[PDB]
Amino acid sequence: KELENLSPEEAAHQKAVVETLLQEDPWRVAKMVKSYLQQHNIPQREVVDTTGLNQSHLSQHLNKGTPMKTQKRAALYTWYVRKQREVAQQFTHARNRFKWGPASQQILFQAYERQKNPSKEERETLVEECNRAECIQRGVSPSQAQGLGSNLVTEVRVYNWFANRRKEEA
Amino acid sequence: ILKELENLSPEEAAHQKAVVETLLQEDPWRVAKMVKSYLQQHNIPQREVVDTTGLNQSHLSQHLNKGTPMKTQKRAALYTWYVRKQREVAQQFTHRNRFKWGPASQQILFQAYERQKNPSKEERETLVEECNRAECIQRGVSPSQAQGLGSNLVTEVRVYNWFANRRKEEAFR
DNA sequence: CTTGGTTAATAATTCACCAGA
DNA sequence: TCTGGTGAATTATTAACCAAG
Numbered sequence: 001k002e003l004e005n006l007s008p009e010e011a012a013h014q015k016a017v018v019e020t021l022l023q024e025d026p027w028r029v030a031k032m033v034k035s036y037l038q039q040h041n042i043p044q045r046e047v048v049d050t051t052g053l054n055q056s057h058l059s060q061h062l063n064k065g066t067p068m069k070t071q072k073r074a075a076l077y078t079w080y081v082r083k084q085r086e087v088a089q090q091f092t093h094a095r096n097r098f099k100w101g102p103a104s105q106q107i108l109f110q111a112y113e114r115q116k117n118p119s120k121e122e123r124e125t126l127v128e129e130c131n132r133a134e135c136i137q138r139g140v141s142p143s144q145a146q147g148l149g150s151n152l153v154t155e156v157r158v159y160n161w162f163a164n165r166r167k168e169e170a
Numbered sequence: 171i172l173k174e175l176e177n178l179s180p181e182e183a184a185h186q187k188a189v190v191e192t193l194l195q196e197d198p199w200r201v202a203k204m205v206k207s208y209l210q211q212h213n214i215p216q217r218e219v220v221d222t223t224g225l226n227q228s229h230l231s232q233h234l235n236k237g238t239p240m241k242t243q244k245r246a247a248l249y250t251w252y253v254r255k256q257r258e259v260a261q262q263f264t265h266r267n268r269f270k271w272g273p274a275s276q277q278i279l280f281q282a283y284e285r286q287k288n289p290s291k292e293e294r295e296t297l298v299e300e301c302n303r304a305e306c307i308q309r310g311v312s313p314s315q316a317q318g319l320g321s322n323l324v325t326e327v328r329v330y331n332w333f334a335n336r337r338k339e340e341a342f343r
Numbered sequence: 344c345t346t347g348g349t350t351a352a353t354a355a356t357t358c359a360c361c362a363g364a
Numbered sequence: 365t366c367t368g369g370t371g372a373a374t375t376a377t378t379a380a381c382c383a384a385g
Contacts (some may be wrong), residue, residue: 008379053372054371054372055366055369056370056372056373057369057370057371060370060371064368066368067367067368067369067370068369068370069369069370072369072370095378097378097380098378098380099378099379100377100378100379157379157380157382160380160381161379163380164378164379164380
């Protein structure tokens with residue numbers, strides 16, 4: 001079961017962390033929040049949907065060094081620190097639209113450069129070849145940590161990454 | 171309250187039905203490029219099209235900027251809109267939509283800035299008219315005193331926010 | 344299956360807009 | 365004479381179906 005996602009002493013840590021970041025340099029902290037969001041391909045939307053921060057604003061702050069009031073940044077830094085409810089999910093092999101991580105794509109291109117063939121066999125030869133990459137890229141790495149949740153490479157996807165790439169070239 | 175007392179002309183419409191009827195045979199993409207260049211030049215919000223072409227924003231874009239296949243009926247709504255749109259040639263003649271900076275105006279504003287960020291209202295309303303020139307010129311009809319740029323007509327306030335923004339554009343890099 | 348068509352979503356961008364010093 | 369902060373709006377880009385050879 002779950003009985004850990006809430007510890008006062010532990011939480012204190014979360015909180016204490018936010019006040020170290022809200023004292024650090026915003027853009028330094030920002031590009032940290034970005035890198036994570038990147039590494040873990042987390043829908044920008046998921047953040048907004050919860051911090052109540054303005055999409056345009058957030059984007060502008062994470063990609064451009066646009067000024068964000070402390071209280072706001074507090075909202076972000078928190079969500080960020082509390083988000084590691086995600087490692088608990090990659091630690092226990094036990095919505096959001098799927099997103100192709102750069103890692104999986106760099107290879108998705110192979111089969112294409114090699115042979116745009118959609119073989120439901122030489123597909124898996126990449127499905128777990130992507131997921132192994134996705135898992136690697138984002139800290140963890142057990143070929144089996146299924147904590148990829150919604151970003152997990154599947155054939156309800158790979159087949160499409162080829163399909164689409166097809167409808168492209170002329 | 172400008173007039174268009176021929177707006178509903180027999181021949182006039184007849185010709186419209188024929189041209190869309192033509193492009194509809196022409197290469198779908200060559201037409202797009204055409205529709206795109208018009209939209210670009212006159213800096214028309216893609217959105218204005220979508221609202222009245224009942225076409226899918228994503229779709230309209232993909233077709234116009236990429237080689238995305240669109241079935242006839244829609245591409246029909248497009249052209250029809252396109253040719254009907256070329257009505258506003260009246261607006262530029264007979265001397266509600268978010269404003270936008272055409273390239274010609276912008277390439278000119280960078281100087282008035284890289285030169286010296288001087289936002290002197292003495293120099294602002296000087297620029298408004300200089301860009302407002304390029305705009306008309308870039309888009310044929312050059313009757314400067316023909317506020318035909320309508321929603322896209324450069325104003326003192328714009329150049330302000332522009333300069334303002336560009337300055338504040340110099341943040342964490 | 345897959346290619347013509349098509350889009351709900353997501354997010355970068357653009358242009359503003361406002362509070363004070 | 366703006367400038368930190370902010371955001372409603374617009375649009376390129378995503379990852380999808382879906383009908384039908």
